[PDB]
Design an enzyme around this catalytic site. Structure first.
Site, mmCIF file in Angstrom:
data_model
loop_
_atom_site.group_PDB
_atom_site.id
_atom_site.type_symbol
_atom_site.label_atom_id
_atom_site.label_comp_id
_atom_site.label_asym_id
_atom_site.label_seq_id
_atom_site.Cartn_x
_atom_site.Cartn_y
_atom_site.Cartn_z
ATOM 1 N N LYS A 1 0.835 -1.202 0.000
ATOM 2 C CA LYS A 1 0.000 0.000 0.000
ATOM 3 C C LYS A 1 0.869 1.252 0.000
ATOM 4 C CE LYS B 1 6.713 -0.592 1.856
ATOM 5 N NZ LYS B 1 5.899 -1.772 2.298
ATOM 6 C CD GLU C 1 17.316 -11.348 7.047
ATOM 7 O OE1 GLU C 1 17.486 -12.583 7.013
ATOM 8 O OE2 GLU C 1 17.011 -10.745 8.094
ATOM 9 C CE1 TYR C 2 17.362 -13.262 -2.267
ATOM 10 C CE2 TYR C 2 15.145 -12.308 -2.395
ATOM 11 C CZ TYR C 2 16.100 -13.226 -2.835
ATOM 12 O OH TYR C 2 15.808 -14.126 -3.837
ATOM 13 C CG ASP D 1 0.252 -4.622 10.438
ATOM 14 O OD1 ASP D 1 -0.965 -4.901 10.322
ATOM 15 O OD2 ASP D 1 0.927 -4.147 9.496
ATOM 16 C CD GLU E 1 -1.469 -9.715 4.391
ATOM 17 O OE1 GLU E 1 -2.259 -9.376 3.473
ATOM 18 O OE2 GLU E 1 -1.703 -10.666 5.161
ATOM 19 C CG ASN E 2 3.183 -7.286 7.833
ATOM 20 O OD1 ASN E 2 2.358 -6.637 8.492
ATOM 21 N ND2 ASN E 2 3.686 -6.847 6.680
ATOM 22 C CG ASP F 1 5.064 -3.480 8.171
ATOM 23 O OD1 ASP F 1 4.081 -3.581 7.411
ATOM 24 O OD2 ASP F 1 5.378 -2.405 8.733
HETATM 25 O O1 AK1 Z 1 6.733 -1.767 5.292
HETATM 26 C C1 AK1 Z 1 7.364 -1.494 6.307
HETATM 27 N N1 AK1 Z 1 7.109 -0.394 7.036
HETATM 28 C C2 AK1 Z 1 6.058 0.445 6.857
HETATM 29 C C3 AK1 Z 1 5.050 0.172 5.926
HETATM 30 C C4 AK1 Z 1 3.979 1.048 5.763
HETATM 31 C C5 AK1 Z 1 3.904 2.207 6.530
HETATM 32 C C6 AK1 Z 1 4.897 2.491 7.462
HETATM 33 C C7 AK1 Z 1 4.783 3.745 8.285
HETATM 34 F F1 AK1 Z 1 3.539 3.901 8.683
HETATM 35 F F2 AK1 Z 1 5.124 4.791 7.560
HETATM 36 F F3 AK1 Z 1 5.564 3.671 9.346
HETATM 37 C C8 AK1 Z 1 5.973 1.612 7.629
HETATM 38 N N2 AK1 Z 1 8.357 -2.279 6.741
HETATM 39 C C9 AK1 Z 1 8.748 -3.430 6.168
HETATM 40 N N3 AK1 Z 1 9.755 -4.142 6.670
HETATM 41 C C10 AK1 Z 1 9.946 -5.225 6.016
HETATM 42 C C11 AK1 Z 1 9.104 -5.359 4.969
HETATM 43 C C12 AK1 Z 1 9.102 -6.563 4.022
HETATM 44 C C13 AK1 Z 1 9.314 -6.165 2.557
HETATM 45 N N4 AK1 Z 1 9.227 -7.339 1.657
HETATM 46 C C14 AK1 Z 1 10.214 -8.201 1.383
HETATM 47 N N5 AK1 Z 1 11.381 -8.003 2.018
HETATM 48 C C15 AK1 Z 1 12.542 -8.870 1.838
HETATM 49 N N6 AK1 Z 1 12.228 -9.929 0.900
HETATM 50 C C16 AK1 Z 1 11.056 -10.101 0.286
HETATM 51 C C17 AK1 Z 1 10.794 -11.043 -0.517
HETATM 52 C C18 AK1 Z 1 9.595 -11.001 -0.957
HETATM 53 S S1 AK1 Z 1 8.704 -9.710 -0.372
HETATM 54 C C19 AK1 Z 1 10.055 -9.257 0.527
HETATM 55 S S2 AK1 Z 1 8.132 -4.125 4.889
#
Ligand code: AK1
Length: 262
Positions: free
Chosen positions: A23, A42, A91-92, A136, A140-141, A154
């Protein structure tokens, strides 16, 4: 590691294929140019974070993650920005999301389910000790490492205790805007256990209003195939009264968890 060193810029990275959509932005494979270290980036937008009033939340996530170190938590190494965008250095996770794994397999067997629940409970036990509530938890997380180990990610919505999509994973105290603590993660854990075994979460509905109604009442049933041990764990987690919910220690020592986890 090379991602612990420095003021990062976008030019420090080769960008690869998209790993996922979100999103608040897309996630891409990336390679750090000096070291050839493979990671994920990201890409979030300033205007979008500004308008939602979540810039401080992103700063807090980076700050929280700077302290957390656990094999079942995905690393967030730090962040940087340009004129219009903010970039998270991550991290991947080579085996992707649990969300995608569930789409592919439809449902998980008791062994895979208990094993994921064990890893999740270990990660959450560590967070709660460092007083961090995730808030959360959902498929998905949850991401998967090289060896198929679960990694929670996340912390954008995380808070210190006490204190975007569907309502499916949120407990009554959160949907009703009430005071809430670490027990919110215990409810979400129960929801996940159900979804892992059944293929959909227990309060799923075509409308927000129906999901709200069913969560408030804790109104759900189990399909015939869910075993008595799984029913017991899930029912003791999905309690309206947060104080009555199992502790993480009690989850890890649950007979069904002990019998089925690897
Ligand atoms: O998305 C985050 N933070 C956030 C998101 C919305 C809003 C806010 C705010 F409100 F502004 F604080 C903060 N953190 C995240 N931390 C790790 C994530 C995972 C990302 N995905 C991947 N990562 C590594 N490998 C793979 C492989 C497939 S997918 C994938 S997302």
């Amino acid at each position: 590691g090379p991602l612990g060193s420095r003021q990062w810029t976008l030019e420090d990275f080769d960008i690869g294929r998209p790993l996922g959509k979100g999103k608040f932005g897309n996630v891409y494979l990336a390679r750090e140019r000096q070291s050839k270290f493979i990671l994920a980036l990201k890409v979030l937008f300033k205007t979008q974070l500004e308008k939602a009033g979540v810039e401080h939340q992103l700063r807090r996530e980076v700050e929280i993650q700077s302290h957390l170190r656990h094999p079942n938590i995905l690393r967030l190494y730090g962040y940087f920005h340009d004129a219009t965008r903010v970039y998270l250095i991550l991290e991947y996770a080579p085996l992707g999301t649990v969300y995608r794994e569930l789409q592919k397999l439809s449902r998980f067997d008791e062994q895979r389910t208990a094993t994921y629940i064990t890893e999740l409970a270990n990660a959450l036990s560590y967070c709660h000790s460092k007083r961090v509530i995730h808030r959360d938890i959902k498929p998905e997380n949850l991401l998967l490492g090289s060896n198929g180990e679960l990694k929670i990610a996340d912390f954008g919505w995380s808070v210190h205790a006490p204190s975007c999509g569907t309502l499916d994973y949120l407990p009554p105290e959160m949907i009703e805007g009430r005071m809430h603590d670490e027990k919110v993660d215990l409810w979400s854990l129960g929801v996940l256990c159900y979804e892992f075994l059944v293929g959909m979460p227990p309060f799923e509905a075509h409308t927000y209003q129906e999901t709200y109604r069913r969560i408030s009442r804790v109104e759900f049933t189990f399909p015939d195939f869910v075993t008595e041990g799984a029913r017991d764990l899930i029912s003791r987690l999905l309690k309206h009264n947060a104080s009555q919910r199992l502790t993480l220690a009690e989850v890890l020592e649950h007979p069904w968890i002990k019998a089925n986890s690897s």
